Design a protein around this ligand. Structure first.
Ligand SMILES: Nc1nc2c(ncn2[C@@H]2O[C@H](COP(=O)(O)OP(=O)(O)OP(=O)(O)O)[C@@H](O)[C@H]2O)c(=O)[nH]1
Ligand SMILES: Nc1nc2c(ncn2[C@@H]2O[C@H](COP(=O)(O)OP(=O)(O)O)[C@@H](O)[C@H]2O)c(=O)[nH]1
Ligand SMILES: Nc1nc2c(ncn2[C@@H]2O[C@H](COP(=O)(O)OP(=O)(O)O)[C@@H](O)[C@H]2O)c(=O)[nH]1
Ligand SMILES: [Mg+2]
Lengths: 160, 427, 427, 426
């Protein structure tokens, strides 16, 4: 479990960097939405975020932040395969693995997700902007980290 | 939000200004090209202080470099951080000042500065809340001294109520490396006292003394000499740009350090003189620091505290340190320094705490003060300037250009006016 | 029907207001977003159910509003209740009153009109400010003056940072301290004061924390503040009003400077290990150790005293415990008023906060008093202000700012009057 | 009802004090955490003499401790039963003395006792009516003899008419553990005879003798030694706390065994002793106590009482026994021992009976005594003190700290009046 845990700690450092650059990420998301001129629907797809970064990215720092966020998502997707082969698990473990796959899925939505109690992303982002436009993209990382910690605790409590 | 413009003159600050703009770029996580690869957005809120934005997400310098000898411009342009300055910031002339105050002022300076003054409106009018200007120059070199003081004259008249900060290197007792130093300095300090808000004095000899007795660097090249001088003025400006638990702007230091108008020469210092081999031998503690801000060795001039008189002291602390331990120990040291600080201003000192440290260091302090013994730094020039005029030295390089002999006698009285005021109000 | 408008000016006072309003959201149980009639006094119900406090944070510098704009409590506040000026006053009363202070006074009163119209019947205002710097001193003066002219007789309470006698981070504080106390003499009605040093000192020998921050200073200040206005917010056994202790703590409208004290001030394990009773929460109030103003209650005489209680308490002990106090001999009141008290009882105990350092207690109390002990403390403070004018130091900054040379002589007569008015009281 | 305060002085006082509140917390059923768990209800009825009520059924000692060595105070902090002591009830100084009397009293005494009286008055006004004070001080130690007198002096000047029951350790022939002990002991008696209500002369040598010859322990460390000393203190102070068939509170105890305003030294004894050979061979009855009451093997002071007489003897017998059995055992020996006692005071023993026995024990007996055998202990203490001034040795430290030589001679004026008053009635 330590081999996946090293990548988990690296992803924790990367998520800390993204939380520090949350304001820059929000500014980049607003600039991409203004360039795409489609503010009616909220951001819901990782594929939509990638398409926003490919064409509707304005600044070099914004492009770097979008690339860092996409690289964090790709590293999470790559570490999901290594976490899958750790243990066989129970039916609840399989359900949580399917939930992790759905959370890493680009086609699955993100607006219905919300930040956890330790996270302060809701306490940082704007009221209407996170309520209706881009709350889920900010909140997806901490819920995924909490689910990974819960899965690690479940595997630790589960006998091999 | 708050913006202040930097003008550069002389080859001296051309060597600081590459190192000085290294540190602020280092503090803001900026690549040598000029783009951004950082961790937090906190610096980006007040990264606009000394830069402007550019299209395509780029940040351009607010630093204009002027010299009459184009050699140091291109070297700065081709230096380690040479591809960052925007290419109209450089202005270069033809005939250098030649360490002559006269040569760089009237017959050669006037042709350059009119094109330079057009660059001043291009940089000043871009800023919304322009607090003032800074200028790094030299008293030993001709272009930094003579042409710099002309800029001091022209900018203040057109922009009357701003803040003028000058970080000037001053002549030394035993590292006198130019023959005309009491001619160059006196023809500048005749206009420096008259027309400058903030003046900082840097002594070369103490910088050699700092890197020897406590740093023990093996080869103290000018990169090391520019390193601390940049770091001191980096810590001066971080309270204007970076938020701390107790903040102080640049005018905040300007109002309280200056009781009388003609006394605005400042003596600075930098605290962590930690060596390369004894980092783990030092308890990184503020009870180590206060005897390091007020030791017999950590000053940056040839002005001993027992030969001096501390009017005002600003101790800008940088890093994550507790409030109460610092505030009591600042109360501690003023008490035991009974005869070292002045008596007719009780509660002499300002503490200043900025939360964010410099990189690679937990806590950091800068000791900045005004002392009367800067006149003892000046009286070395004053005992050298008066006797040298009696034997009629070096007039042809000056009086052959066109100034009368009478205002040279005014300067030795005007420089005598300055040291008279320190001695009168000492008691 | 009872409501208030809170004002915060000055990077001391506004930095208190962050943790000050931290308590009110926690005490009323309202989220930092602002979503879920004790809460109607301060917050304002948006039609969607959002609660916006009726508090305005105005400072001329953008370094601290942006901290509020980047704080945890971003979603709490209306977009226009935070108004930021261009340039801070920077330890200059007249600059913050004449030249800079006139720029955004029209903006603050525009926000004052809007918070006034929402109240069909109004109790009082709560400004928060400091005596040290420029903006929290200079601007708050004429802000107090124009609210005095605009509004007839509503309650005017002032929370001010008193300059500590030994430690004083400002250098031109005595020119700032005297010039503000001139303006507050004629149009300020209640002036609560806290001084830095005793706040630093008393949290050492009681909280026993080696390394605190100003956040510890605010929450120590905060429960003093909240206990004053808890009478408006909630019901209890015996409730007071803002106007009531205004009549109590100000026996003479020329003298409106009371001090503050708070109890129990003990740590967590101590409250575990010491028994919390009604007897022990009132004897510490008349101990001299917990006096959080740098003056001697043994020297001064308690003219008018206010006591507000919190937590679990029975009025039988309240009448019993005060009988111990009146029969003591170390605490000496005035001769002309043996009935110098105003005692109140509130059921709601103070609540600990996440990230706090205090304890959770059974019962609590804020000790308020008007006394002449600060007159002897102002004898030293007048001595500091006398010494600034013998040598005519520091005047030339203000001469071009807009004030007059004879205004220091009148203010010298004013502090002579204010010291003599206390000296007329003690006869 | 009646509340009491425990002063403490000296490093040696800590080990006496820490074992004391270790012994008496057990006999009421108190854990070091501070949660009472017991069945006896009479303990909580009279628990208010010593402790102070806290939240949630916790009680905190009224113990005041003064010292100049934080290292032993750190041990008291790290002690097992020391975790019930109150934080500011500790009064600990950073500067030492050096086992000399002057440093604790004059130089370091000018600052530390201001922190003591604030602790006292904090504890004093929270009580109903304060019965008095106890201080465990010393004569051979510099710090305990030093501040102990100034602890005595200012409280007597603050408190006019109360009780002052102290426990002080006296010099010995063979357990001489300080050279300037005769310097320290004699001038400490100068502040004792004028200004102390009760002091109990416990001698170390008998404490060693009883653990060797009488309790027969193979390795009796000091924790055994303080186990005797604490129980001697509690035998004095169990009648004030516990009801008995014949109760005698401390004030009338202070009335009865102090006949004169000065000659109020005491010589304890407490012998419910049982050797590790002899758990079952004893016949634990009231008559066996009486033979053990006046056997020399049981008393705390290294003196032979056959060279004198007992002045006043109090025999507090605590346990289940009948008064007719109690008095008659002593009634016979008052008639029988016509020589060993004083003749000017007939009926030389007045007793007291307590019902509740100590924990871990069935029946126990105390002793309080003033005697006319303490001359030669007082005589031998004086004779070197005179002899230490003939060569004038060791006095320049006391002299060099600003003091007079006459203060060493004025005690010899006062101590000789002490020993000559014992000579008057003998
Ligand atoms: N109690 C308390 N006092 C503070 C705190 N921070 C600063 N001060 C006091 O504030 C004084 C300086 O005034 P400022 O806080 O700067 O207020 P100001 O008038 O607006 O001056 P500027 O902020 O520079 O515009 C100092 O003398 C400090 O004593 C704090 O956190 N708590
Ligand atoms: N400490 C220090 N002194 C310098 C530096 N550069 C120049 N100087 C001093 O400046 C003097 C020459 O000034 P210069 O740079 O040529 O100015 P200019 O002639 O006006 O262009 C010499 O005496 C040096 O002592 C530097 O990087 N560090
Ligand atoms: N009863 C008892 N006496 C002790 C103990 N330890 C030391 N002593 C005696 O105390 C004397 C030394 O006292 P000292 O420590 O110098 O007193 P201090 O200097 O005030 O701390 C020695 O003569 C011992 O006989 C102990 O644990 N119990
Ligand atoms: Mg401020």
């Amino acid at each position: 479990m330590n081999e996946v845990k090293e990548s988990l700690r690296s992803i924790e450092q990367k998520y800390k960097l993204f939380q520090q650059q949350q304001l820059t990420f929000t500014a980049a998301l607003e600039h991409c939405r203004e360039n795409a001129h489609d503010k009616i629907r909220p951001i819901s797809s990782i594929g939509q975020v990638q398409s926003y970064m490919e064409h509707y990215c304005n600044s070099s720092t914004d492009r770097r932040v979008l690339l860092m966020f996409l690289d964090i998502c790709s590293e999470l997707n790559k570490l999901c395969q290594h976490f899958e082969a750790v243990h066989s698990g129970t039916p609840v473990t399989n359900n949580l693995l399917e939930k992790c796959k759905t959370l890493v899925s680009q086609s699955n939505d993100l607006s219905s997700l919300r930040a956890k109690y330790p996270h302060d992303v809701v306490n940082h982002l704007s009221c209407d902007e996170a309520r209706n436009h881009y709350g889920g993209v900010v909140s997806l990382i901490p819920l995924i980290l909490d689910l990974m910690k819960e899965w690690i605790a479940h595997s630790e409590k589960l006998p091999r | 939000m708050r913006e202040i413009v930097h003008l550069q003159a002389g080859q001296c600050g051309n060597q600081i200004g590459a190192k000085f703009w290294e540190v602020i770029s280092d503090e803001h996580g900026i690549d040598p090209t000029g783009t951004y690869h950082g961790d937090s957005d906190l610096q980006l809120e007040r990264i606009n202080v000394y830069y402007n934005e550019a299209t395509g997400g780029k940040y351009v310098p607010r630093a204009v470099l002027v010299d009459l000898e184009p050699g140091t411009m291109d070297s700065v342009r081709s230096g380690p951080f040479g591809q960052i300055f925007r290419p109209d910031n450089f202005v270069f002339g033809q005939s250098g000042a030649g360490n002559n105050w006269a040569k760089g002022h009237y017959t050669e300076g006037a042709e350059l500065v009119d094109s330079v003054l057009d660059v001043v409106r291009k940089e000043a009018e871009s800023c919304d809340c322009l607090q003032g200007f800074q200028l790094t120059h030299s008293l030993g070199g001709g272009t930094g001294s003579g042409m710099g003081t002309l800029l001091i004259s022209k900018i203040r008249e057109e922009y009357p109520d701003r803040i003028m900060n000058t970080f000037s290197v001053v002549p030394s007792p035993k590292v006198s490396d130019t023959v005309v130093e009491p001619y160059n300095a006196t023809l500048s300090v005749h206009q420096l006292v008259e027309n400058t808000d903030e003046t900082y004095c840097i002594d070369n000899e103490a910088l050699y003394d700092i890197c020897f007795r406590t740093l023990k660097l093996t080869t103290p090249t000018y990169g090391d000499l520019n390193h601390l001088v940049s770091a001191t003025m980096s810590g001066v400006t971080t309270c204007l740009r970076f938020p701390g638990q107790l903040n102080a702007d640049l005018r905040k230091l300007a109002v309280n350090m200056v009781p009388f108008p003609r006394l605005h020469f400042f003596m600075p210092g930098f605290a962590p003189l930690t060596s390369r081999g004894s980092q783990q031998y030092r308890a990184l503690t503020v009870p180590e620091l206060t005897q390091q801000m007020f030791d017999a060795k950590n000053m940056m001039a040839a002005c001993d505290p027992r030969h001096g008189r501390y009017l005002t002291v600003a101790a800008v602390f940088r890093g994550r340190m507790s409030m109460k331990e610092v505030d009591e120990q600042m109360l501690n040291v003023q008490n035991k320094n009974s005869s070292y600080f002045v008596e007719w201003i009780p509660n002499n000192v300002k503490t200043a705490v900025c939360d964010i440290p410099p990189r690679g260091l937990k806590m950091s302090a800068t000791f900045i003060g005004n002392s009367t013994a800067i006149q003892e730094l000046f009286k070395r020039i004053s005992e050298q300037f008066t006797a040298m005029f009696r034997r009629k030295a070096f007039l042809h390089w000056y009086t052959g250009e066109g100034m009368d002999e009478m205002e040279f006698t005014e300067a030795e009285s005007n420089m005598n006016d300055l040291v008279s005021e320190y001695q009168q109000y000492q008691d | 029907m009872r409501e208030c408008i809170s004002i915060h000016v000055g990077q001391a006072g506004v930095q208190i207001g962050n943790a000050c309003w931290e308590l009110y959201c926690l005490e009323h149980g309202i989220q930092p977003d602002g979503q879920m009639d004790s809460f109607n006094t301060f917050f304002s119900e948006t039609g969607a159910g959002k609660h916006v406090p009726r508090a305005v944070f105005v400072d001329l510098e953008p370094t601290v509003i942006d901290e509020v704009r980047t704080g945890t409590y971003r979603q709490l506040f209306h977009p226009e209740q935070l108004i930021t000026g261009k340039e801070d006053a920077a330890n200059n009363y007249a600059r913050g009153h004449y030249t800079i202070g006139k720029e955004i006074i029209d903006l603050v009163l525009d926000r004052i009109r809007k918070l006034a119209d929402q109240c069909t019947g109004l109790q009082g205002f709560l400004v928060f400010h400091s005596f040290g710097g420029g903006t929290g001193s200079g601007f708050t003066s004429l802000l107090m003056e124009r609210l005095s002219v605009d509004y007839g007789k509503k309650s005017k309470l002032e929370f001010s940072i008193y300059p500590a006698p030994q430690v004083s981070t400002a250098v031109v504080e005595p020119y700032n301290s005297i010039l503000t106390t001139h303006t507050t003499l004629e149009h300020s009605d209640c002036a609560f004061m806290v001084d830095n040093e005793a706040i630093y000192d008393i949290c050492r020998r009681n909280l026993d924390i080696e390394r605190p921050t100003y956040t510890n200073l605010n929450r120590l200040i905060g429960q003093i503040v909240s206990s004053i206005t808890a009478s408006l917010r909630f019901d209890g056994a015996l409730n007071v009003d803002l106007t009531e202790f205004q009549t109590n703590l100000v026996p003479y409208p020329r003298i409106h400077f009371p001090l503050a004290t708070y109890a129990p001030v003990i740590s967590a394990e101590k409250a575990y290990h010491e028994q919390l009773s009604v007897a022990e929460i009132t004897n510490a109030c008349f101990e001299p150790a917990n006096q959080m103003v740098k003056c001697d209650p043994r020297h001064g005489k308690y003219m008018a005293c206010c006591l507000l209680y919190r937590g679990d308490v029975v009025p039988k002990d309240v009448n019993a415990a005060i009988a111990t106090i009146k029969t003591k001999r170390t605490i000496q009141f005035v001769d002309w008023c043996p009935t110098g008290f105003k005692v109140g009882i509130n059921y709601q105990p103070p609540t600990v906060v996440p990230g706090g350092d205090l304890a959770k207690v059974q019962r609590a109390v804020c000790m308020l008093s008007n006394t002449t002990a600060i007159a002897e403390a102002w004898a030293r403070l007048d001595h500091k202000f006398d010494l600034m004018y013998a040598k005519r130091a520091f005047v030339h900054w203000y001469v071009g700012e807009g004030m007059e040379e004879g205004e220091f002589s009148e203010a010298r007569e004013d502090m002579a009057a204010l010291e003599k008015d206390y000296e007329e009281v003690g006869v």
